[PDB]
């Protein structure tokens, strides 16, 4: 019928839609029980055959009744002859849907999980052998694109379920199939155990060149620090043991990494010998690729909180790298190591300095000390070296901040604060404050005197600080005020310590490094973020925390004095009235607390 | 928990036996507000109490009072005592009085005779009970 008969056409479309669903429903419920063999040719010829040509175009969005028919036939071995019909046009129809660029994840998943079923369901006929070959070739070619489109974790998993099915069958024995399969895997990298078992199988059975597995070697090497579970770590080692026999160059590295990681418990004597092996002439020999996995293991040993011996060797192992950087004839060879040092060590050092455990922190403190003492090619720590005064003891302050005695620690933080101006702004924020701030929030009474001296030093450090880091430092501590009730007294006193350097810098300009030239921009930052937040906290009616929140007002006046005079008139009244309202409170002890605070503000 | 003839359960809360995702039975709880921290024994408890301010179908609204517990002998309710100084103008002097208030207490709270309890107004739980213990000290 032509276009003018709209009503009949719509009803016919409804009949097709309902009946195709009717076919979909009946095959689901009684497909296995009923024998279709008489009707298979009739069903295909009148239903499937007319629509095979446009199937790919129609069903890209979401699964349809007609698509679900071929999915069901794909799962059931008995109904594969539906796929076999007409040179696998039915299977090719499912193929081309995947081939389409506009195909969405909802349609991808069922077809892929259907393709897995055909791969895992051997059938004894010639048509089956051809069918699997066509399905594999299309999928492997196009796998990396599908993974990008996928947005569901389960959809990721089913891809690995198909992918491991390929390895078990043995399409990977073909070199082209192996190359396409590897391309999909790096797309997945660019569930985890299933990935590792897949990598083991592909790389175990067949040989690979260094250029092929080099990028894999780096990322799988970087996965050492990332993994922590024994099953996850052990499975990684057989790969490196495996990558070793693939490329004779890596064989030495994997044997080392295999003996660096020993399992369930680590072999303490043999690993100790390896550390003695590297420290005694082994560390001049190993190359940059050799150094990569060794660090990821060393950074794993230093963070470990149970054993001391592995750590000192690990921290010493990290210092051998710094020696190994010194050994270069020039900067060019060092630069590749320096960039590698910057990419890996420095980020993990900074988090290590923030590590709560003191003794883990002490090692990272020691590693940071050695680099500054030996700065032949790495010049970022020159400023902190100036603080060291050639690494002199009681002047280097790396020991002082972590002697056994507490009084020597306190004397360090004062001298560090005094000489803050000489130091470079980035270093103060990334290393020094992280290493020293935990004293402020330390609960032990032995460190209470240390904490009070710390609050002064960080205030001096905050003066000679870069503008962006000081903002981020200040914002974090306001977040600590709302988030941490226990640390609220420590945060508020510290926020006051941060308020003073901002006030003085704003006084001088009308000091913080890279301070903006225009005073409006810092002023608006105070007006909209520091003022409203601090004022509302001070105005909060919580009688259990009023005394701890009183020094907030001292922070309010400091930031306000930094502002312009019109702002100062706008902002002093609300603060001082709130101080006056707290002054009005009946409690004498509170009233005295207001009186002293008003005195300091005066 | 199941010490009654009927089965005690939180209404409209369903634990699906077939799925069996988690051993712990699904528990519904709410915060009563007013900065009154919901205790963890209520969150991770196993009791069933329709009149509990955190797990029951009761809302705290109205006057919030404080008192001293004087009796804790009956089940899930207590009697507190509130004292004040009433002014008599004819001689211009104050006289002490007291009032005894029955208050519901959830099993999530452990109260003895002598402690200070802050209680909240709610719908009439019983003939004389209209409050619910919401903070113990």
């Amino acid at each position: 019928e032509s276009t003018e008969e709209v009503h009949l056409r719509k009803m016919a479309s409804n009949l097709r839609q309902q009946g195709l669903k009717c076919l979909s429903s009946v095959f689901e419920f009684v497909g296995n029980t009923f024998d279709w063999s008489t009707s298979m040719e009739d069903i295909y010829a009148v239903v499937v055959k007319p629509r095979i040509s446009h199937f790919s175009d129609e069903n890209l969005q979401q699964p349809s009744s007609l698509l679900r028919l071929f999915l069901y036939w794909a799962h059931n071995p008995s109904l594969y002859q539906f796929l076999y019909y007409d040179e696998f046009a039915t299977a090719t129809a499912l193929m081309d849907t995947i081939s389409n660029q506009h195909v969405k994840e909802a349609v991808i998943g069922p077809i892929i999980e259907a393709a897995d079923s055909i791969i895992r369901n051997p059938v004894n006929d010639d048509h089956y052998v051809d069918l699997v070959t066509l399905i594999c070739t299309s999928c492997l070619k196009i796998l990396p694109s599908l993974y990008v489109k996928l947005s569901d974790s389960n959809s990721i998993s089913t891809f690995l379920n198909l992918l491991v099915s390929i390895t078990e069958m043995g399409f990977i024995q073909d070199d082209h199939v192996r190359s396409r399969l590897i391309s999909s895997l790096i797309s997945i990298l660019k569930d985890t155990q299933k990935i590792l078992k897949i990598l083991k199988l592909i790389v175990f059975n067949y040989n690979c060149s260094w250029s092929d597995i080099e990028e894999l070697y780096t990322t799988i090497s970087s996965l050492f620090k990332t993994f922590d579970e024994r099953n996850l770590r052990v499975s990684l080692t057989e790969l490196f043991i495996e990558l070793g026999r693939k490329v004779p160059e890596l064989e030495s590295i994997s044997k080392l990494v295999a003996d660096l990681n020993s399992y369930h418990e680590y072999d303490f004597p043999r690993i100790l010998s390896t550390f003695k092996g590297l420290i005694e002439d082994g560390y001049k020999s190993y190359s940059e690729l050799e150094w990569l996995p060794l660090l990821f293991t060393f950074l794993h040993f230093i963070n470990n909180k149970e054993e001391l011996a592995l750590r000192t060797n690990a921290s010493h192992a990290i210092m051998k790298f710094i020696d190994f950087i010194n050994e270069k004839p020039n900067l060019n060879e060092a630069s590749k190591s320096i960039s590698m040092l910057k990419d890996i060590l420095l980020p993990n050092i900074r988090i290590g300095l923030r590590d709560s455990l003191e003794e883990v922190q002490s090692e990272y403190v020691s590693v940071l000390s050695y680099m500054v003492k030996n700065t032949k090619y790495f010049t970022d720590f020159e400023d902190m070296a100036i603080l060291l005064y050639n690494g002199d003891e009681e002047a280097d302050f790396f020991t002082n901040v972590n002697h056994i005695q507490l009084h020597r620690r306190q004397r360090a933080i004062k001298r560090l604060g005094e000489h803050a101006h000489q130091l470079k702004d980035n270093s103060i924020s990334h290393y020094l404050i992280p290493m020293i701030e935990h004293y402020v929030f330390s609960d032990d009474e032995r460190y209470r005197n240390i904490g009070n001296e710390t609050q002064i030093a960080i205030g001096g450090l905050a003066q000679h600080m870069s503008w962006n880091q000081y903002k981020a430092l200040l914002r974090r501590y306001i977040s600590m005020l709302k988030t941490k009730p226990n640390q609220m007294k420590q945060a508020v006193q510290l926020i006051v310590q941060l308020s003073v350097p901002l006030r003085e810098t704003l006084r001088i300009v009308r000091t913080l490094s890279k301070f903006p030239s225009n005073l409006d921009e810092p002023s608006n930052f105070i007006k909209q973020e520091l003022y409203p937040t601090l004022s509302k906290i001070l105005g909060t009616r919580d009688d259990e925390t009023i005394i701890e929140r009183m020094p907030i007002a001292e922070a309010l006046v400091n930031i306000v004095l930094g502002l312009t005079n019109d702002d100062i008139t706008n902002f002093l009244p609300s603060i001082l009235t709130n101080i006056c309202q707290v002054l009005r409170s009946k409690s004498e002890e509170l009233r005295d607390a207001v009186r002293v605070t008003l005195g300091k503000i005066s | 928990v199941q010490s009654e003839r009927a089965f005690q359960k939180q209404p409209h809360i369903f634990n699906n036996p077939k799925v069996k995702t988690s051993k712990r039975t699904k528990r519904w709880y709410k915060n009563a507000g007013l900065g009154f921290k919901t205790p963890k024994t209520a969150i991770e408890g196993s009791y069933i109490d329709k009149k509990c301010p955190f797990t029951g179908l009761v809302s705290i609204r109205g006057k919030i009072l404080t008192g001293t517990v004087v009796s804790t002998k009956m089940h899930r309710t207590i009697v507190i005592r509130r004292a004040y100084l009433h002014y008599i103008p004819k001689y211009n002097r104050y006289e002490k009085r007291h009032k005894n208030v029955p208050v519901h207490v959830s099993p999530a709270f452990r109260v003895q005779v002598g402690d200070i309890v802050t209680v909240g107004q709610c719908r009439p739980i019983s003939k004389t009970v209209r409050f619910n213990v919401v903070k113990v000290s």
Partner: protein, 234 residues
């Protein structure tokens, strides 16, 4: 009861106590009885356009009076706060606002001012079929509101279409009209909102003279920003 004694009438109409035995009882409508102005008192005892209730009834059957752009023929129709009374035969538009004394004061306005009103958001909730809507102080249900609109905000409503053209959030520094208590009719800027959960919230308001006063939130109506009211004030 269906009869109201003139002495027993609440205070705000300014009606003389000795005129008669009974006063008009406001009928059911958008506003509560104790803060409504039935059209009879507005037309007779404030404007004096009518001398007796029968003359008022002739006026209303003439369909000369419109409340919020709609013709009303009930003598005791309860006009209230932020209600626009339009008289086309004489070309007047009036807005009903408390005075400092606390009486309704007859305030002439422009036609553009007449075209809209201000409504305090009393409630915001999802209706049937998942359609959000807002209930204002005059009982107006307005569907598909702007998401940022919340309770205690004030929405500027166009009378002709009854849609939301703009809104004002409830925040410190906003200009406010007091609709209850002793401060009824006073205008001032918000200073601080003191919250008692489970109790009546209290708001501090500072006038242009720097005098400060405290009032319950229920008697608070945001009318604009400090120095920029959205309605003409008396």
């Amino acid at each position: 009861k269906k009869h109201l004694k003139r002495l027993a009438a609440p205070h705000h109409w300014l009606l003389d106590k000795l005129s008669g035995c009974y006063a008009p009882r406001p009928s059911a409508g958008p506003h509560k009885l104790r803060e409504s102005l039935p059209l009879i008192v507005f037309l007779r005892n404030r404007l004096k356009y009518a001398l007796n209730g029968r003359e008022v009834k002739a006026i209303l059957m003439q369909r000369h009076v419109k409340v919020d752009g709609k013709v009303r023929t009930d003598t005791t129709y309860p006009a209230g706060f932020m209600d626009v009374i339009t008289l086309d035969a004489t070309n007047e538009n009036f807005r009903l606002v408390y005075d400092v004394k606390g009486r309704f004061a007859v305030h002439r306005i422009t036609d553009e001012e007449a075209s809209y009103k201000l409504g305090k958001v009393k409630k915001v909730q999802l209706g049937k079929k998942g359609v959000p809507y807002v209930v204002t102080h005059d009982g107006r249900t307005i569907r598909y509101p702007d998401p940022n609109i919340k309770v205690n905000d004030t929405v500027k409503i166009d009378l002709a279409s009854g849609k939301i053209t703009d809104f004002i959030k409830f925040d410190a520094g906003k200009l406010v009209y007091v609709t209850g208590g002793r401060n009824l009719g006073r205008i001032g800027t918000i200073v601080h909102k003191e919250r008692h959960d489970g109790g009546f919230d209290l708001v501090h308001i500072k006038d242009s003279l720097d005098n400060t006063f405290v009032t319950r939130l229920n008697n608070v109506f945001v009318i604009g920003e400090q120095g920029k009211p959205y309605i003409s004030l008396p």
